[PDB]
Amino acid sequence: MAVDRLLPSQEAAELIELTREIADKVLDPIVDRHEKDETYPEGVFEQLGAAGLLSLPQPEEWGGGGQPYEVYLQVLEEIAARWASVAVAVSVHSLSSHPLLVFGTEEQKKRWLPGMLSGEQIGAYSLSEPRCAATPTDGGYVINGSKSWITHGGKADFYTLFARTGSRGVSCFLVPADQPGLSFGKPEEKMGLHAVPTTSAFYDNARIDADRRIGEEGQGLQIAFSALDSGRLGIAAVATGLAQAALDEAVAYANERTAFGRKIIDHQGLGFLLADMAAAVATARATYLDAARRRDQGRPYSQQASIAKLTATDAAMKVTTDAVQVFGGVGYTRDYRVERYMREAKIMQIFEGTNQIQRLVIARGLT
Amino acid sequence: MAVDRLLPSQEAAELIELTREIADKVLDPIVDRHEKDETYPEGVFEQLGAAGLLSLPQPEEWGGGGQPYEVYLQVLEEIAARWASVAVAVSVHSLSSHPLLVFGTEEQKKRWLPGMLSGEQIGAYSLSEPQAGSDAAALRCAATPTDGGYVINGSKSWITHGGKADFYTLFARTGSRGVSCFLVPADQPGLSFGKPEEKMGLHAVPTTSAFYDNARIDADRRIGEEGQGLQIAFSALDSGRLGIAAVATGLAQAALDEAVAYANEKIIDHGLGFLLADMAAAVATARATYLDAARRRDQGRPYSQQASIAKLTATDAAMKVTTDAVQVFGGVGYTRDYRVERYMREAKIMQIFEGTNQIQRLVIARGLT
Amino acid sequence: MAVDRLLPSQEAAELIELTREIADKVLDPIVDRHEKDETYPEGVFEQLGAAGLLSLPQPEEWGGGGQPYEVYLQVLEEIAARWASVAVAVSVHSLSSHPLLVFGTEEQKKRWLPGMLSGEQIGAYSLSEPRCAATPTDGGYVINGSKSWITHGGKADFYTLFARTGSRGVSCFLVPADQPGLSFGKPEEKMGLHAVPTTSAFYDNARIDADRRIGEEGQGLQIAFSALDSGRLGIAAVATGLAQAALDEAVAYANERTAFGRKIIDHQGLGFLLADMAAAVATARATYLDAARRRDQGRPYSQQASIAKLTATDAAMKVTTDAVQVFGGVGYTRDYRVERYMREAKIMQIFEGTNQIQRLVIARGLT
Amino acid sequence: MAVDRLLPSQEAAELIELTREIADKVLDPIVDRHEKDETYPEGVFEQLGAAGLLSLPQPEEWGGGGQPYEVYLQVLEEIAARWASVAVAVSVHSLSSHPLLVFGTEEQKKRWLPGMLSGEQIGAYSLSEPQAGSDAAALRCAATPTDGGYVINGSKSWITHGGKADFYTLFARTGSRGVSCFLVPADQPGLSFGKPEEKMGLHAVPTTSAFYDNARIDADRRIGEEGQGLQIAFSALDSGRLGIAAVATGLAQAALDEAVAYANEKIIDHGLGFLLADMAAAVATARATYLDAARRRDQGRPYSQQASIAKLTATDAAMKVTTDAVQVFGGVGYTRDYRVERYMREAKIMQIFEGTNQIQRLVIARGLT
Ligand SMILES: Cc1cc2nc3c(=O)[nH]c(=O)nc-3n(C[C@H](O)[C@H](O)[C@H](O)COP(=O)(O)OP(=O)(O)OC[C@H]3O[C@@H](n4cnc5c(N)ncnc54)[C@H](O)[C@@H]3O)c2cc1C
Ligand SMILES: Cc1cc2nc3c(=O)[nH]c(=O)nc-3n(C[C@H](O)[C@H](O)[C@H](O)COP(=O)(O)OP(=O)(O)OC[C@H]3O[C@@H](n4cnc5c(N)ncnc54)[C@H](O)[C@@H]3O)c2cc1C
Ligand code: NA
Ligand code: NA
């Protein structure tokens, strides 16, 4: 009943089985309770970290696994099938370390990367706003202004920040949890995806060392643009895992429940609905792996990653809406998980670039 | 920012005007808090009933307002744009009086009908069981004949207004022509209600199960002949399916108004125009479809196919429009700072009750055979 | 098996039965042959004309029927179910007379309207181009330039023309068939809708009397804008009739053909496809009548007419594509009509304002 | 303006390069005229065969090119972007050699296989009858046993390359396990072909019926055991469904390139951007889906579900992309001055043959049971 996967090696299959074993004993027994109460899973990230699952695609020299995206994306997909909000946070952690790895000095990487990729820390990514500025000073910078929609806000070990210093008018910072002048608003009240908090930040004459600026002064916009494709790939794989979870529920229910003297899967009309869901899940998985396989070969994959995010998140919204339908009246109650999965899928159409903005990007790439 | 309506007279126009006033004064200011807390709205059904709004379509000789469906359904639409859960309950009340009005004895009508349509009472309708929602004929609640009556033993489920209605229209087994209809009072001995279902949305009016424990009932409470029940339940389908078509259209219209206002406060420019255009087409199309079926009914013509088409069309539109309305707001659309996330949760169950959209398609195909 | 219609009177029902009787003996026995050979139905318009069907909505004082749009649109729908290209031409004829009726002088109407609405003439409408100018002269105007996509081009008795004389820089003309300086290109080779020709026009120092200018000099753009809503309503009703014809074929075929030991309509999956088609036909008919009913009461109906054209033409493309599917392999051959109906529906999405341009119009009406 | 392909080696890249050259030189300059006139392309299959293009996937020990499906299918895609009717015929030729290659005797293979894969021959595949397309088991063409052979009496239909192939793979009735397979030569006595079907599109290679009139055949021509036929026909389904997925993707890609060029010559501005964006997503998604199934096959793993999904997905995409490509051109898109009106007519039959898209859905649902 588990997905039959296309994998490059024996060691990759054994990584998949390891993820499935940890997810089923650390994630599955606690997910419904924490999402209902909107409480934080303390200690869950440490256990994922110790099994090597928080630093899979980063180079081994810096303490990562050096796994390709074709393998890493599928592990992410397996996590999301058990707990979507935790999978989103695992993806955010990968992006949070990208500036230092790609643009940091040799001195900066020896100082901080081992710690970031040890499995004991968790990172957050901070660029969105509701005009946040860093002004020069002796030996560094002073920060003033506001930030919005930070995943893991208030709970992370470190924060990646973008702040104004025209074209080359932006700069990137590695900000520590203990930063003087830094505070966080209350967690947002959302329709779903409750466990990992989402918060805004406020900087009040916050002073920072020059040694925490990542890359050259003005290199900000280039740094942030360099991480778009990888983020969209992350969310494509998360949406695919939630679509798979909703499909597994419906398939199981349609093989037990009966009406008019037969199992409901045996009514041809209902069978066709289930068939469209399964085709949409398999098309979304095929599309993200095709982009992944380009990235692993050092080929351009920018158009392909926008297509993958678009395809996968539209698929999840359609499949979860249809899984409630398969259940009937009980599917509309909290005795089952399908109502929660439908609430989680809607926000995937919106973040990491809205789907309208994905269509715009694809268009500009044909003009 | 108010729907331009096609109405048969100046009188109907003022009745719409009366509805907008009551809904904006009584329903709109308390709806967010009651849906969030999951509590019952005391006093609300008493206020609508005194205005005439709970008995519009029924004949005046029995205390109704005599209105045609072309007017009744559009009043229902205006209500549902403020509070979907309340309008669903209004629709159920109409169905709950239907078996007595069409099938009862003149003596039975004289007893009970005037109190039902008075504006102070609330009706509920009870047909579904756990092993039988879509498939009606497989029901099993037992009503077995006694000296001058019946004894009822069994279970029912998914009762809208369960545990709060003044009367219940019941369907129980006496023997294919084995089913009968009953008017059950709220004080019936042996009758009890389980706890309210915990749902994804539509929280205010409760949905509950029922249990009959040696519930002896007078044989004068039976509506129609013994074994007539499935014919009674079948005759109400057309009317109920139009009710819900009107409710889904008003929920879609409410979500469309939120998104138009937001896109103007421009966010429209920064392909949102085309998304809003497709939303506006969906609402207009659903409204015209339910009205076409209504005029056929008002004229005394066949309207069964057209009523299935209206319900399917209007509920598929609410699910699509509410989902795209969250999309128009962006990230704040996904928070409880606005109403659109609630509207999306309310639309899903509409695709499911009053005959699922797969049953609707099966009805339509049969009408082509 | 004929459509059950909502009609205002006894006399309207009897108009419907008259249309059905004429269409079934004048149109149905000859449509497949003329469309296959791409030849013109000489004499068909005279017979429609003599039964009063070419001037149904124009006022009785000028020789029309004074019928409301709620009745006229449904007659048009009945014609289109038998021969779509002839129905489009009937609609074009209504528009061709609109300028003179609404903006013409009392002298101009006594001269020409009775003839136009007698049933012996046929009119065409000429505004599209691939910059056509009328320059002043003693006693009138001289015309130079080109026009495109004229339905009935080369075969009409009269032509409604728009030509340049900024804001108020356009003027409208009633041009006769015998106009010196006027010629027509060869008929366009289209995917379908062959019987009534579509042509371009060329004006070569073409001199015209001032008495043929309709309305004031500069009133052109206002005249042309005043006819948009009515045209869109015409095409909505034509698309609805072609969708109905494709649905009737498929329903008939699905009740005879058998597979796996049962009539194919009895396979629930196929039954659901037929059910979606029927719902789309009924939704399109409901939408155009709702706009019609506004126009009959002197209420605004501009947004509603754009919605109706959009809804109905998208419905026809979906229903005709699905009717071929119901037929299987035989549906892809010219032994049946469903392949022709699919070719006819595509051009309805395009003309009288493309569907993208309809979406734009609806958007501007919410801004 | 050329597809960026993922390929397993430099050798495969050059084979793609060879395909683009032959297709642009031989197919592209004559395609519009032959499809318009409805005539056969003499010399064309002879030229592709000498380049190795008619036997790519089969083993070298028998004269094929040994290519995996991940390469074969993408060559098929490049062809179909120039001439859809020709690429369909290439796909059929592969299926026509399949029963002999997997089920025959070593002695049977030695006789006939090398000539089939030589590049000079053309194969056809014959299964469907008028009373049996979707439902295979209901076939009725009779093959009755004689002294050292069989006698064939009956009718077959919808034969691609009917009346022009060098050999025919036939399925006829001998007795559920009542069906057998036959390799029929083009010079068989008692065999005749009806006139070409008049179709909406795909005109160049003819589709015809066949008639067997006391057609005596040698018992050494039977492929596999007596009563093995339905198992043989079943085993070819997975392969044929991928062939057509590749053909539909290349037809969609051709229609996408036309519309992108036109929108740039701006027409894009005057919501065409969003329509083109959805077209580009549909093509990319169909390509990735057929390739995922191909790599499973190349690895010797189960790929049945994934092959049904690929065919359904890729043909639904061709119908949607070709229909929107006419839309991008406007009025001139509806004329025979451009290719897009032809592409739209070609896409419709793809939803129908090699198992209709309703049968595909039925296969997928069963795999979930
Ligand atoms: C909030 C709420 C309020 C309600 N209020 C009332 C009420 O007041 N009175 C009342 O009588 N009922 C009420 N109901 C019950 C409601 O009408 C049923 O839940 C619904 O109609 C479907 O029945 P089910 O839940 O048993 O689904 P099932 O019948 O178990 O169906 C499950 C799935 O199988 C499919 N299916 C079933 N049969 C077929 C078929 N023949 N062909 C193809 N597919 C099929 C369905 O479409 C569905 O997707 C209420 C329900 C809810 C959720
Ligand atoms: C151009 C062309 C070339 C062809 N070439 C070949 C060839 O080379 N070799 C060959 O063997 N065949 C060939 N065919 C035949 C082709 O495979 C069939 O036409 C097709 O698969 C469908 O069968 P049918 O036409 O009898 O449709 P039918 O089986 O009559 O089906 C009609 C409709 O009913 C539906 N239906 C049928 N069964 C079910 C079911 N169980 N559940 C739900 N719905 C169902 C179908 O989806 C379809 O919509 C060719 C056909 C064409 C058009
Ligand atoms: Na430590
Ligand atoms: Na005359």
Task: Output the CATH code of domain C228-367.
Answer: 1.20.140.10
DSSP string, C32-51: HHHHHHT---TTHHHHHHHT
CA distance A341 to A319: 10
Locate tokens 């939120």: which residue?
Answer: B258
Give SS3 for C1.
coil
In B60-200, the DSSP E strands lie at 123-126, 142-146, 149-160, 167-173, 179-185, 191-193
Nearest ligand 1 atom to alpha carbon B354: 17
DSSP string, C299-342: ---HHHHHHHHHHHHHHHHHHHHHHHHHHGGGGGBTTSSHHHHH
Respond yes or no: is residue B120 known to be catalytic.
no
Residue B134 in contact with partner chain A when CB distance is under 8 A: yes
- Report the candidate in A34, A2, A27 with the shortest Cα–Cα distance to residue A17: A2
Locate tokens 């209901």: which residue?
Answer: D138
- Report the candidate in A181, A178, A188, A118 with the shortest Cα–Cα distance to residue A152: A188
Residue B268 in contact with partner chain C when CB distance is under 8 A: yes
Write out residues 291-320 of B within 8 Å (CB-CB) of A: 319
CB atoms C325 and D361 under 8 Å: no
Enumerate residues 6+ apart whose C-beta is below 8 A from D33.
Answer: none
Minimal Cβ distance to C307: which of B284, B292, B309: B284
Fold of the D237-369 domain: Butyryl-CoA Dehydrogenase, subunit A; domain 3 (1.20.140)
Enumerate residues 6+ apart whose C-beta is below 8 A from A333.
Answer: A339, B197, B198, B199, B200
- A48 is written with which tokens? 């994922």
CA distance A90 to A81: 13
Cβ(A344)–Cβ(A192) below 8 Å: yes
CB atoms D302 and A268 under 8 Å: no
Helix count (H) and strand count (E) of chain A?
13, 10
Q: Are strands D167-173 and D123-126 parallel, antiparallel or unpaired?
A: parallel
**How distant is the alpha carbon of residue D201 from its chain centre?**
15
CATH of A4-122, one of 3.40.50.300, 1.10.540.10, 1.20.1270.360, 1.25.10.10: 1.10.540.10
Enumerate residues 6+ apart whose C-beta is below 8 A from C364.
Answer: none
Cβ(B181)–Cβ(B229) below 8 Å: yes
Helix (H) or strand (E) holding D254: helix D237-264
Residue C278 in contact with partner chain B when CB distance is under 8 A: yes
- B293 is written with which tokens? 């079926």
> Which contacts (CB < 8 Å, 24+ apart) does range D131-137 have?
D133/C328, D133/C329, D133/D158, D134/C259, D134/C260, D134/C328, D134/D355, D134/D356, D134/D359, D135/C259, D135/C260, D136/D230, D136/D233, D137/D176, D137/D179, D137/D230
Enumerate residues 6+ apart whose C-beta is below 8 A from B139.
Answer: B127, B129, B132, B171, B172, B173, B179
Question: Which amino acid, D254?
Answer: A
Cβ(C332)–Cβ(D349) below 8 Å: yes
Cβ(A39)–Cβ(A195) below 8 Å: yes
CA distance C232 to C238: 10
- B192 is written with which tokens? 């009890």
Neighbours of D214 (CB within 10 A): 9
Specify the DSSP class assigned to residue C264: G
Enumerate residues 6+ apart whose C-beta is below 8 A from C269.
Answer: A268, A269, A271, A272, D358, D361, D362
- Cα Rg of chain C, angstroms: 21
- Cα Rg of chain A, angstroms: 21
Phi, psi of C214 (to 5 degrees): -95, 115
CA distance A156 to A123: 5
Annotated catalytic residues of C are: 352
**How distant is the alpha carbon of residue D116 from its chain centre?**
17
**How distant is the alpha carbon of residue C365 from its chain centre?**
25
- Burial grade of B174 (CB within 10 A; 0-12, 13-18, 19 or more): middle
CA distance A150 to A160: 10
Phi, psi of D152 (to 5 degrees): -105, 120
Enumerate residues 6+ apart whose C-beta is below 8 A from A111.
Answer: none
Vertex D338 angle, CA D333 and D344, to 5°: 65
Locate tokens 């001998």: which residue?
Answer: D174
For CATH 1.20.140.10, the residue range(s) in chain B are 237-369
Q: How far is CA A101 from CA A108, A215, B200, B302, C271, in A?
A: 9, 11, 44, 72, 58
Minimal Cβ distance to A271: which of D6, D277, D365: D365
Substitution candidate for ligand 1 out of B353, B359, B363 with most atoms within 8 A of CB: B353
CB atoms C269 and A268 under 8 Å: yes
CA distance A162 to A146: 11
- Report the candidate in C57, C54, C48, C40 with the shortest Cα–Cα distance to residue C21: C48
Would you state the torsion angle of the CA atoms of residues A274, A280, A286, A289, taken in this order, to the nearest 10 degrees? Answer: -120
Cβ(C301)–Cβ(C323) below 8 Å: no
CA distance C246 to C236: 16
Give SS3 for D30.
coil
Largest CA distance in chain D: 75
Burial A38-57 (b: 16+ CB within 10 A, else e): eebbeebbeebbeebbbbbb
For CATH 2.40.110.10, the residue range(s) in chain C are 123-227
- Report the candidate in A274, A116, B36 with the shortest Cα–Cα distance to residue A265: A274
For CATH 2.40.110.10, the residue range(s) in chain B are 123-236
- D73 is written with which tokens? 């299918």
Resolution of this PDB entry, in A? 2.3
- Report the candidate in B321, B320, B316, B340 with the shortest Cα–Cα distance to residue B329: B340
Chains that touch C (3 or more CB pairs under 8 A): A, B, D
User: Which numbered ligand comes closest to the C-alpha of A114?
Assistant: 3
The residue whose CA is least distant from atom 29 of ligand 1 is B134
Fold of the A123-227 domain: Butyryl-CoA Dehydrogenase, subunit A; domain 2 (2.40.110)
Neighbours of A185 (CB within 10 A): 17
> Which contacts (CB < 8 Å, 24+ apart) does range D190-195 have?
D190/D152, D190/D214, D190/D215, D190/D216, D191/D215, D193/D159, D193/D162, D193/D163
- CATH 3.40.50.970 for the B123-236 domain, yes or no: no
Phi, psi of C330 (to 5 degrees): -60, -30
CA distance A108 to B125: 71
Cβ(A329)–Cβ(B197) below 8 Å: no
Helix (H) or strand (E) holding C200: strand C198-209
Query: CA-nearest residue of chain A to D364?
Result: A275
- C317 is written with which tokens? 């493309």
Neighbours of D10 (CB within 10 A): 8
Give SS3 for D207.
strand
- D348 is written with which tokens? 């419709």
For CATH 1.10.540.10, the residue range(s) in chain C are 4-122
For CATH 1.20.140.10, the residue range(s) in chain C are 228-367
Beta bridge partners of A333: B199
Vertex B224 angle, CA B218 and B225, to 5°: 90
CA distance C150 to C188: 10
Give SS3 for C97.
coil
Largest CA distance in chain C: 81
Helix (H) or strand (E) holding D123: strand D123-126
Total residues found in chain D within this entry: 369
Give SS3 for C153.
coil
Q: Are strands C213-214 and C198-209 parallel, antiparallel or unpaired?
A: unpaired
CA distance A175 to A165: 16
Would you state the torsion angle of the CA atoms of residues A346, A348, A351, A356, taken in this order, to the nearest 10 degrees? Answer: -80
Enumerate residues 6+ apart whose C-beta is below 8 A from A304.
Answer: A287, A290, A291, A294, D284
Helix (H) or strand (E) holding A142: strand A140-151
- C283 is written with which tokens? 């939704």
Cβ(D203)–Cβ(C337) below 8 Å: no
Nearest ligand 1 atom to alpha carbon B162: 8
CB atoms D271 and C360 under 8 Å: yes
State if residue A267 touches ligand 1 by the CB under 6 angstroms criterion: yes
CA distance C353 to C65: 28
